[PDB]
Design a protein around this ligand. Structure first.
Ligand SMILES: Nc1ncnc2c1ncn2[C@@H]1O[C@H](COP(=O)(O)O)[C@@H](O)[C@H]1O
Ligand SMILES: Nc1ncnc2c1ncn2[C@@H]1O[C@H](COP(=O)(O)O)[C@@H](O)[C@H]1O
Ligand SMILES: Nc1ncnc2c1ncn2[C@@H]1O[C@H](COP(=O)(O)O)[C@@H](O)[C@H]1O
Ligand SMILES: Nc1ncnc2c1ncn2[C@@H]1O[C@H](COP(=O)(O)O)[C@@H](O)[C@H]1O
Ligand SMILES: O=P(O)(O)OC[C@H]1O[C@](O)(CO)[C@@H](O)[C@@H]1O
Ligand SMILES: O=P(O)(O)OC[C@H]1O[C@](O)(CO)[C@@H](O)[C@@H]1O
Ligand SMILES: O=P(O)(O)OC[C@H]1O[C@](O)(CO)[C@@H](O)[C@@H]1O
Ligand SMILES: O=P(O)(O)OC[C@H]1O[C@](O)(CO)[C@@H](O)[C@@H]1O
Ligand SMILES: [Cl-]
Ligand SMILES: [Cl-]
Lengths: 317, 321, 322, 322
């Protein structure tokens, strides 16, 4: 009859006898994304009246709206060294986010994004200090994650999220400023001949991965196409809709990869898994890895299940 | 005092004793870009009215043609998508030929990542006129990229940027969506002489010429300089990054694409003019793209565009084999 | 920390152990208002694509409002002022809310593109009653009063877009921020001043008014104590919105041709009365509070005297002393 | 083929062998109007960024209008209605155009966010004259008449944004398309109807009017031939804009407290008179055409009787027969 907005979708997804905290958290996130997108679309130009980096603005916006929701006890921005504990205005959700992913693409104004992961406090635990929070993040796994999403700020703005019952994607309609459901129940194809990785680091890769990449180029069965925007959110978003593989492997300088576990990889892993893909690191599922440090890094091999299997076959043989 | 709009810039760039036709052509192009950008930002969603009761390629092409044909300044239009040129009806006929790709990076449309529009403007050679496609075919064959009066692109990314040149450098403008004006944000764009970024589809490695394979391996394996790779998959996106950051963009020959992929009139020549005007090099199979002769309308060419020293390194591998 | 959006406000207002139907109804209304506002701001111009390939705003507004309300699953009955009959929602998609609305108030101001609006009132089904037909609905509206109304609101499409609503705990006003397309709380707990020297009525109908009202209007002009200013936009939503924020009085009285006034009870007057009362003003008709009047017909008319409590008292003093 | 933008219209209207200064002035005005409209649509809310880190609309509008006009290099003299003095442009950046404007007309309607506007009139320096000081400018405005005016326009910030202008060859109206931020020609060659039964005036001042005008207003109400409708938004730009498209009359007459009326001659009345006259209406003051009156003071007031030619004739008939 009329198309479904993100606002409707969030409210209609609320199970009976919920507090409404999670719903208010999603509303806060949605509003952040709009504010952040508006500043990005302006490329940070001042208004014509009155004749601030976009990282800084995005981070300020995301924090402000999440702290105003009363649903969080802990915030973690990838940029900042410490977590923020909400005063005690304190729910039981921990949010970890990267507010402006693909920061090297900002000056060219190509695709960039935001990523977030939401965890709930384990039962019979509470956080009054950073030292409590440090203890708590160490006992969390990606499989205990209640929600994940990203926003891609591209030629259009897309918001893609999951609560553990599949993945739904929404496109911002700028006439009325609402996110409209355009990609329901996203299902990443089981195979697709596209790969996404920075081959500038070829010389520093492990031999098994070098062999993998050479096979993609030299094999006689299947021609592969290469794409690498340089923003994880941009590349993953293409990977979800088109199929393929996204890789950021180990290298001589980055022994545990580049991407952060809490802030980027675990959230994206949940989305990719919920869309029917695989999402692995050094040893199986990213969602099963233990958090030891807050800023822990991990390699990633995310995408179409058969494309990730091929990749791991090179590592296993 | 106040920032310069594209509209001001175009009018203030008009040389004394011009007809004003070129100015009206730029205004028409500017308006097209705004209309196209708006449909792209909506990802082609119908209005909420339309849902109770069209590909982006098709819409972009319709928009670009309509505004250019309304300007009274063109005699010939060429859209990359279409097989033939369109001759304007006489009565509404200037002496400009426009060749354009209205939606570059069409494989990126469904993901809604960066895409673009590209155009090149030529003037009729003195003592010539076009009444038919056969006249137009004769005329394009006597044109070179060095006779081009104007070139530009629009990048539809996280912001919308319009970058253009009239032969006196390159200026870039960012769309301010509050007031719908293009504001001068990148005056006199100067592409760095070197930068360690390269842009090419390495999925085609196996089908490349050995000299280019060696080039790419050197970028990866050499011990002096670490290179970063970027390839969005839209020429306008990749070139725009190349102009502001420096680096190199390559679409070389391969076994299946013997003369490369990118069209000479519609894409490569216009981009070559922009890159050259910003201080970079822009070469094909044998020197400057702007010096190549148009034989066919849909003629292809390889491209090696970017920072001068990065394009020199690339050609050094071809010259030493 | 950050300013409150309408979306937050609606969710945070949800009492514990509600079904969430009312919340979904407000979201549907909010979305309608944005869609309607966008078409109004364009003055109904086709897109630049629509022009090369080559709908009244009343029709579009009505289509939008109905579509979003019927998609919410919370209504059983819709009533648009324009249409002769009520619409009963198909069972399967049927809550227990009745919405009566005027989707584009001030229709004579459309061509000039000055202030126009939308108005709605929300009622709940009386306990142990249900509607399967227009004949059931007709029975049910007759047993409703304005005092049984669970919610009322309007949207003003002016130089800015404002949405003003109440659920029986005061009146809050929100301004559309067009950058991000959210309604932001700008006028919390609206309190209409007890007096203000502004009056709003169509004096083109002076000759057809009752003598007591003629005397009232002459007093406003001729008295020696207090100079009054006149304002009449011609859209009830525009005039009432000014009245709420500035104070004053809005009148549409009886006349020779309009014996029971012009404005409809269910669609316009009762919803506005609830808002005005919740903001501290008075809102009366032929005989006391509009909210106490009985609905006899669906399209029943009533005179209105809405506004600042002391300005409405002065007005009624002229009627009571004759 | 495609619809005409204001930008196209301005350039195509440029006569052969013009300097282009006037064209640049119109572009500057157009851009001002968009900037002003955007701040008005936000009701002056700070951005959501501005709120975490923690300006009247009259002040912002005035700053915007001045900045864009001073950046055009085409003006020597600016006059904002709000300010007491004229601004002389610094020499080096000095054309021969004098602009007089009211950047935010209808200031009493700002808080309610109903219709408001901007008005401007453009004059050219008389041949063999120049301005180096306010004292030169004062001499020059005294020798100007409304008939020497090269251009006039207004912007109405209503439910949509309309820009209406004239260069002495009729009146054309443009509606802002907010998708692409361009003014699109929607009302070409505006022709105000010769008669229409609508009148616009503040009847709150009835008691202080001259007897002839009281008789006029009573005739509109009491006569047996023609029923009149009353409309008064309270913003001259809003009321006039309705008058141009619908027909009728707008009046701000003399009163006991305002012996020469309220509206300023240079800033409001003369510009509107030019527009109304160019659309086929009449626009008179105390003694014939407003455009023929002599400027004695900068802030000189005048009564106005603007609108449909037969409606203004009826009005003046009451003054001529007493
Ligand atoms: N809008 C929603 N969409 C999906 N799941 C939800 C929603 N609201 C609540 N839930 C689920 O119910 C849990 C508890 O909700 P709450 O009591 O609101 O914190 C959340 O952690 C979610 O797993
Ligand atoms: N607005 C402008 N900006 C830059 N160059 C222009 C402009 N207008 C005219 N020209 C140059 O002058 C030539 C003739 O202009 P016209 O007579 O308007 O077609 C064009 O081919 C351009 O090279
Ligand atoms: N978001 C809300 N704001 C104010 N009142 C509400 C809200 N939600 C529910 N209510 C009140 O509770 C009643 C029943 O709610 P429901 O069970 O959702 O139909 C409504 O008729 C309202 O009076
Ligand atoms: N774009 C235009 N539209 C209408 N009239 C114009 C335009 N440009 C110039 N004129 C007329 O020509 C006169 C001188 O123009 P200028 O030489 O630009 O100062 C102006 O006062 C106008 O009457
Ligand atoms: O410059 P590199 O090493 O390709 O890294 C790009 C990566 O960095 C990030 O910006 C994270 O820091 C990701 O968005 C992206 O995948
Ligand atoms: O898919 P491929 O072969 O890498 O081609 C991408 C190229 O094709 C184009 O879309 C032109 O057809 C360019 O925008 C881009 O550089
Ligand atoms: O033109 P009139 O008779 O003064 O009526 C105007 C009234 O009509 C309405 O449009 C309702 O029909 C109201 O918005 C407004 O108060
Ligand atoms: O409040 P009053 O006396 O009706 O005056 C309103 C008039 O004042 C103005 O704001 C000019 O000061 C006009 O827009 C309007 O016609
Ligand atoms: Cl991109
Ligand atoms: Cl209004």
């Amino acid at each position: 009859p009329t198309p479904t907005t993100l606002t409707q979708y969030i409210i209609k997804s609320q199970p009976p006898h919920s507090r409404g905290d999670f719903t208010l958290l999603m509303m806060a996130i949605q509003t952040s994304v709009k504010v952040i997108e508006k500043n990005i679309r302006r490329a940070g130009m001042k208004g014509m009246l009155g004749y601030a980096k976009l990282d800084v603005i995005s981070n300020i916006a995301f924090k402000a709206y999440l702290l105003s929701s009363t649903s969080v006890c802990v915030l973690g921005s990838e940029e900042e060294e410490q977590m923020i504990i909400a005063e005690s205005r304190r729910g039981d959700y921990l949010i970890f986010f990267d507010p402006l992913d693909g920061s090297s693409n900002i000056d060219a104004n190509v695709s960039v994004g935001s990523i977030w992961g939401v965890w709930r406090l384990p039962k019979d635990t509470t956080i009054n200090s950073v030292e409590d929070a440090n203890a708590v993040i160490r006992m969390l796994k990606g499989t205990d994650m209640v929600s994940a999403g990203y926003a891609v700020y591209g030629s259009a703005t897309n918001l893609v999220l999951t609560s553990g019952h599949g993945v739904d994607g929404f496109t911002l309609d700028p006439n009325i400023g609402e996110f409209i459901l355009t990609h329901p129940h996203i299902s990443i194809p089981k195979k697709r001949s596209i790969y996404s990785v920075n081959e500038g680091n070829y010389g520093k890769w492990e031999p098994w991965f070098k062999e993998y990449i050479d096979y993609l180029k030299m094999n006689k069965t299947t021609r592969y196409s290469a794409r690498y925007i340089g923003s994880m959110v941009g590349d993953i978003h293409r990977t979800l809709l088109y199929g393929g593989i996204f890789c950021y492997p180990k290298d001589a300088n980055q022994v545990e990869g580049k991407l952060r576990l809490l802030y980027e990889a675990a959230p994206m892993a949940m989305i990719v898994e919920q869309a029917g893909g695989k999402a692995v690191g050094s040893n199986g599922r990213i969602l099963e890895q233990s958090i030891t440090r807050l800023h822990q890094r991990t390699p990633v091999y995310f995408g179409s299940r058969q494309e990730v299997d091929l990749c791991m076959a090179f590592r296993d043989r």
